[PDB]
Write an enzyme that holds these catalytic residues in place. Structure first.
Site: not given
Ligand SMILES: NC(=O)C1=CN([C@H]2O[C@@H](COP(=O)(O)OP(=O)(O)OC[C@@H]3O[C@H](n4cnc5c(N)ncnc54)[C@@H](OP(=O)(O)O)[C@@H]3O)[C@H](O)[C@@H]2O)C=CC1
Ligand SMILES: NC(=O)C1=CN([C@@H]2O[C@@H](COP(=O)(O)OP(=O)(O)OC[C@@H]3O[C@H](n4cnc5c(N)ncnc54)[C@@H](OP(=O)(O)O)[C@@H]3O)[C@H](O)[C@@H]2O)C=CC1
Ligand SMILES: NC(=O)C1=CN([C@H]2O[C@@H](COP(=O)(O)OP(=O)(O)OC[C@@H]3O[C@H](n4cnc5c(N)ncnc54)[C@@H](OP(=O)(O)O)[C@@H]3O)[C@H](O)[C@@H]2O)C=CC1
Ligand SMILES: NC(=O)C1=CN([C@H]2O[C@@H](COP(=O)(O)OP(=O)(O)OC[C@@H]3O[C@H](n4cnc5c(N)ncnc54)[C@@H](OP(=O)(O)O)[C@@H]3O)[C@H](O)[C@@H]2O)C=CC1
Lengths: 337, 337, 337, 337
Positions: A153, A180
């Site tokens: 971001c 942030h």
């Molecule tokens: N948040 C922001 O402002 C921004 C963040 N980043 C985001 O993209 C990211 C994702 O973060 P964000 O959306 O904030 O966070 P989150 O934790 O909310 O997003 C995605 C997550 O994926 C999980 N997940 C983990 N491992 C697996 C797996 N093996 N298979 C399937 N699903 C899985 C979740 O599971 P579990 O429930 O167990 O945690 C959960 O809903 C990168 O890590 C990155 O930075 C980039 C740009 C903007």
């Protein structure tokens, strides 16, 4: 048009779906979601959101393995191992990797092993992954890229105006600090990270950490290689951040001229990506802004004629998610299918 | 020896008293407190503190008009108009002005109308008021000064290490940004305020606001006149702030050399004023830091060999209050009988 | 229609305007606002709101007694003394008292002295002031009342379902606790306050304080006189609160029967005032709800067959302001004239 | 003198160690910690704590698999599967189960499989697990119990004064609500969770959820079986909670007599477990209190002579940990080698 999956239905995964839902004539078709939390959880968290508010759409569970948004059914699967996914079987064209755990080639590649044709990581890729920032270097994307990154971001907020500064004034060198909002990667109360600072209670501290843009701007703007560096200070706000960039430029200038340069780009080549705000606002006012970066004009300063300081606001969740949608549209538009 | 009066028993006034209470063989004797809130209030808020915790001392009211701390009875008066205070009648030598409303000569001077011999403003003075930052220019103080300023918390954090940078590398110019904890001057919820940004809900936003710390640094370090500027970002933490300073220096250098220069001063001329921390800590670790400024060594960066970025922590309430005590001590030590 | 004036353009004053702006065919015409903060401030804070988000309307200053909302000019005056207000000169029919400082007859009356025909206090009235809660006892209002009270936010959440419980089961006695969001009346950091608990940092503590919701309920529901009492716990959330009511009833019952009773009223006599939510939601989900009270059905409990516990949500700023508008609408509808 | 192992070095695990460290002549010897996060992490988070402040002790890593606290070395292992732990090899007498994941017999029993002689769950146990609350029913503990539970923080706050209320006035029935600080089980930002309410951003909402505390209070006080029930409201404070208990009693009474009853017990049979505070304090003031429960005397009410409402504070992390140490002390005192 394009068959899309969402791997990881978290903040970005859900923001993405809601961003996509608001687009008109989208080329994308989100047909499936890999939510390890289940159907009931996916439907609930998509409807009710502490940051975006209640989703103005009919959202409900549909059976034991899908949800529906205004009647559109979206399959919901659950598997932590992407090598166990039914992407091939479903004919999935593009996987939106938003789990934050499969950011290298071997990890994201697991989606290809499962049958997905392409992967778009919602974060910096580790390794030899093409990274793109819409409005900065997206024209360099090619359908051969089996795995791409939409950067971070912060990179999306910085690169756009850094590109303008470099073209108009020439950046000798610079540093950046982003105040942030906290993210799920931080701990609610003092726990366990790798990162001993991100291990500390996030709503109680100013947390210095790892910065996520610094080299990465050079990836999308090669001319900046080795010229920037920075850090991040995580603070107690749930969403919306701001970057503070200081750069020494080769061409003498002054604040008003720098702001003018940004407005020009904002009304032209960077329309919809960069905006300039002349109002005395605060972070909450920038929630749900579709641009990647919004210059806070009155805060621009120039010291010694060549040291330019720029303050820019960004909705790290929503603004970034709109860019993920944009990059996905590009993928569709350049498809060789 | 120095009969001291505290005007304005707020955050700084209370932090001051507790800082003072913790000193050994203090040349100061706090005999009275002007608390418009009353004796019960003064006793209660001194004992119980949301940031410092419960005061490890026997605190109680003493009659209508006093309070006691471990037996030491202190007087408590209440008047919003300083001219009407009993400073002369009481023989008050020095008034610690911490109301935030009498920062100019005409205002702070009202304490002199009332009979006090000297005034020490716990904030930048407006107009022609001698400003001093312990460890930077306190040697310039003279008993002839009837009204003096201890600058702001940010200036006290910045000046010490800016002095070191200038001496060792020569500052050409620079900019600063302080990610600052909110303070009583901000509003809990959107409400009136001359500063339309500080008027917004403080625990909900990242609030940009002006700071004079940049120009103030020049007051205590003349060599820096016209060389710095900057701004503040108020964030949702109740105490402890951090300054981000970017300066172009004349002598090429690198991060580890810069950190070394800071340790040298920290172990010598700036002992007890500047510290260098090598631990990956966060804002709550720095609470109750008797120094004025702590460099976070691992965050120091140098771009293009001459653009230095330094991050420094500071407990804006306590650390600053220890400096107020320090300056008071200097007043008592230079008193002319 | 009905020349309305808003005195005190604060959280309630601004929520009120925005609530009113959202109504169709309103019998009210807001023609003036007494904002001691000025025109620029009024326009800014009405447009940008940390809780409600950016107002979706064209808001700008109207050259400088005035502001305009989507073209509708609203005069803006500034005077802390109501007696000096141009109500008589402007022909103001009803003044929305939202300053929180003129809640008794002598105070609120100042608006009558100034020429206003009637006053509606957006808070409990002190002394002999007719109190009304829409959906509970508004039918008792008469045009003869020069000064009325719309009670508090907690009284508006409580009364409606207490009325249902008393009719359906008969309340013998009870107690209540409202875990309430902080309000402007609390201090950002430990500072002076007549109430030693509200003097404490609001975003850092669970602050027990008072309420009058209990005795106030009796005002609008006479049958409840001397049967209830309670307190409030102010917590670190900016908006939205929840009441926990425990009452012993005369008629034995069980949780689902109780919930059923609430749904019956909600679909009938209390439509638009009371709602029943069966979803596992949290405070943020209740932001901007128009009702005065929302029962969290799955939290309803009955111990020993006659001790009923009910949990109800309420947006203390927005939901309450919709009620102010409602009461204003009644004033207009019963106007002699 | 008892060889103790800590499983799960989280909030309670670390609070436990620090509570233990402060005891004089402890019959416990903490020789090992199972921290899946590693040695560096264990040392760091034990030393620097967002809630307790910096640990006043020399804390460092000792090699690749241990840490030292003021010279005392403590072994640090890392395994998510308890059966693989070196308890038998190390001769571990008692394991403090603080992972939150091994709360039933089959789970906690894994430590017995691994060689540990006994297990103390720092939470309610699932199934047939003896539950004890110091000051309430600990005299019922017997060395034969291979797996015991110290109940929950709320149960430890409630049971003590419920015991007094029942003995002195006879509890017919009652209900309870705990306005509870958030814990690691909640999500920082809307994320997956089995509990759709706990899935919501914790620092942004009033969060409605579980407490088996009502039925648990029954476990340690059989006379209360089926007489109580309740719920929890998680709020945006990092630590310290408060219970609101309402009970109809068989013997008519009044608030002051009730407070008296609590002071009697507090100075006698419940000294060190229950306290009564007559000061108008807020949650932060109760941080680090050793007692399990502190009645806020001025908040006690009695409606209709038999409906008693009591408000009690408790430091859910520290106070509870002190009880874990107390229960461990009992285990050591009743050991039958
Ligand atoms: N948040 C922001 O402002 C921004 C963040 N980043 C985001 O993209 C990211 C994702 O973060 P964000 O959306 O904030 O966070 P989150 O934790 O909310 O997003 C995605 C997550 O994926 C999980 N997940 C983990 N491992 C697996 C797996 N093996 N298979 C399937 N699903 C899985 C979740 O599971 P579990 O429930 O167990 O945690 C959960 O809903 C990168 O890590 C990155 O930075 C980039 C740009 C903007
Ligand atoms: N916090 C409070 O106020 C109180 C909480 N509860 C107490 O005890 C709990 C523990 O919570 P708390 O101390 O707050 O929380 P935490 O999350 O901070 O505590 C312990 C944790 O154990 C983890 N852990 C998890 N699984 C394993 C495993 N398989 N092997 C080894 N270590 C493991 C950690 O790992 P990971 O790093 O992956 O999360 C982490 O440091 C129960 O769940 C319960 O409720 C009870 C009373 C008071
Ligand atoms: N807070 C920090 O981190 C630091 C702050 N500044 C501090 O010094 C300030 C004081 O701020 P701080 O201690 O934070 O704040 P506070 O509001 O808590 O401190 C002092 C305050 O004085 C008040 N007061 C106001 N007007 C009068 C009057 N006319 N007569 C008598 N007492 C009066 C109080 O009254 P009322 O009850 O009506 O509000 C209150 O206790 C300056 O304004 C400056 O900036 C500087 C350095 C560090
Ligand atoms: N907030 C909520 O959820 C609800 C609150 N209440 C409220 O109505 C209240 C108003 O509080 P709220 O809207 O929260 O708060 P605010 O502080 O934001 O609202 C009104 C305020 O009036 C001020 N004002 C004070 N004195 C005068 C004066 N002498 N002449 C003119 N304007 C004046 C303001 O000035 P100044 O800028 O100097 O502060 C400010 O915009 C009552 O006090 C009451 O409780 C009731 C129901 C719901």
């Amino acid at each position: 048009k394009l068959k899309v999956a969402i791997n990881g239905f978290g903040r970005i995964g859900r923001n993405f779906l809601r961003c996509w839902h608001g687009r008109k004539d989208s080329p994308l078709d989100v047909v499936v979601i890999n939510d390890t939390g289940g159907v009931k959880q996916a439907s609930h968290l998509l409807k009710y959101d502490s940051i975006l508010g209640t989703f103005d759409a009919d959202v409900k569970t549909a059976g034991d393995s899908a949800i529906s948004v205004d009647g559109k059914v979206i399959k919901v699967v659950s598997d932590r191992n992407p090598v166990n996914l039914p992407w091939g079987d479903m004919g999935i064209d593009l996987v939106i990797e938003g789990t934050g755990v499969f950011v290298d080639r071997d990890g994201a590649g697991k989606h290809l092993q499962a049958g997905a044709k392409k992967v778009l990581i919602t974060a910096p890729g580790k390794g030899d992954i093409p990274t793109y920032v819409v409005g900065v270097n997206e024209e360099g994307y090619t359908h051969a890229d089996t795995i791409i990154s939409n950067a971070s971001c912060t990179t999306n907020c910085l690169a756009p105006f850094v590109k303008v500064l470099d073209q108009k004034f020439g950046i000798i060198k610079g540093t950046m600090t982003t105040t942030h909002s906290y993210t799920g990667d931080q701990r609610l109360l003092d726990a366990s990270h790798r990162d001993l600072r991100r291990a500390r209670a996030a709503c109680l501290n100013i947390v210095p950490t790892s910065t996520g843009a610094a080299k990465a701007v050079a990836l999308v703007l090669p001319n900046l290689k080795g010229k920037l560096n920075g850090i991040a200070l995580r603070v107690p706000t749930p969403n919306v951040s701001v970057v503070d960039l200081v750069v020494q430029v080769s061409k003498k200038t002054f604040a008003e001229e720098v702001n003018a340069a940004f407005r020009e780009s904002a009304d032209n080549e960077l329309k919809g990506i960069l905006s300039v705000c002349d109002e005395p606002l605060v972070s909450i006012d920038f929630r749900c802004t579709d641009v990647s970066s919004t210059i806070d004009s009155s805060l621009t300063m120039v010291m010694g004629d060549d040291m330019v300081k720029v303050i820019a606001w960004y909705d790290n969740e929503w603004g970034y998610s709109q860019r993920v949608v944009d990059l996905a549209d590009i993928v569709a538009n350049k498809w060789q299918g």
